[PDB]
Amino acid sequence: GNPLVYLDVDANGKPLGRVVLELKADVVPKTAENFRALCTGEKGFGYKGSTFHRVIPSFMCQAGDFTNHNGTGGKSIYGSRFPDENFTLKHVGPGVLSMANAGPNTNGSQFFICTIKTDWLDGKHVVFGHVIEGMDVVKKIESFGSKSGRTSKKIVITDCGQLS
Template sequence: LRRARHPDECLLLCSCLAMANPQVFFDIAANGEPLGRVTFELFADKVPKTAENFRALSTGEKGFGYKGSCFHRIIPGFMCQAIRHSGKSIYGEKFPDENFILKHTGPGILSMANAGPNTNGSQFFICTAKTEWLDGKHVVFGRVKEGMNVVEAMERCGSKDGKTSKKITITDCGQLS
């Protein structure tokens, strides 16, 4: 970095830094044994309300969040799904689909689980494959930035019906940037 030569240059730099997408982490365990850390980039530049819901639930700053929650449904070759204990979002029970700009392009995509249109809460899933049939139905809001090996280890604990062979828990979570 270099010093700004003009106040407008400083403003431009500050606004670009402010627009950086947040990163959050989950520390994951299987039956209490650590599997590792998964880091997510949240696409606040495309779906700010959805990204903010996940970010705030990751930090627990509203008095509730993902810490201690489980991945209750894991289907190998499809996805790993989790929910905060009550299923409630930071906006109340449910909030509307923000948009469907982003697509389910492959492993590592982070998307909202729902019970139909405009029923987003705290339930989400991590794709372990391309799932284009979900486009236009589930809001994509992030991606795995690091720790896909941890997601793959989680996936090995799943089954065709989604039941897990081990209890997959978010032991800690928070914001990195």
């Protein structure tokens, strides 16, 4: 089946809780596998110890730049970037997990969790999973963002991995 993975998140050193995500390996196997391995750290790099660097209330929470912590970095398990796999899954509502990019075929490690329906991203960002548990935790992260995307506290993925 599809992988179930987790992110444990803190704000300025204080735990907010766990986000559990289903990865849609049945639809986007290559994209799902990238995120799964970045969660476990099994390639020798990944999300543990990195930040939510861009958080916009009433839009989305963005993370995955584990090299530069600002949207300019990250890398995939395949190399520095990889193709858009497909656009079969849509941005249907809050809790959608989708790849950030700088245009067509620029996927690396950066990703976002939607806090609203972001359907204007359909066909432009590859959706690859959704929140199974911890939308309340995502809403806590969202509260520390701003309309500019800058966060008011340091929001850190203190642990992550695979449940099944």
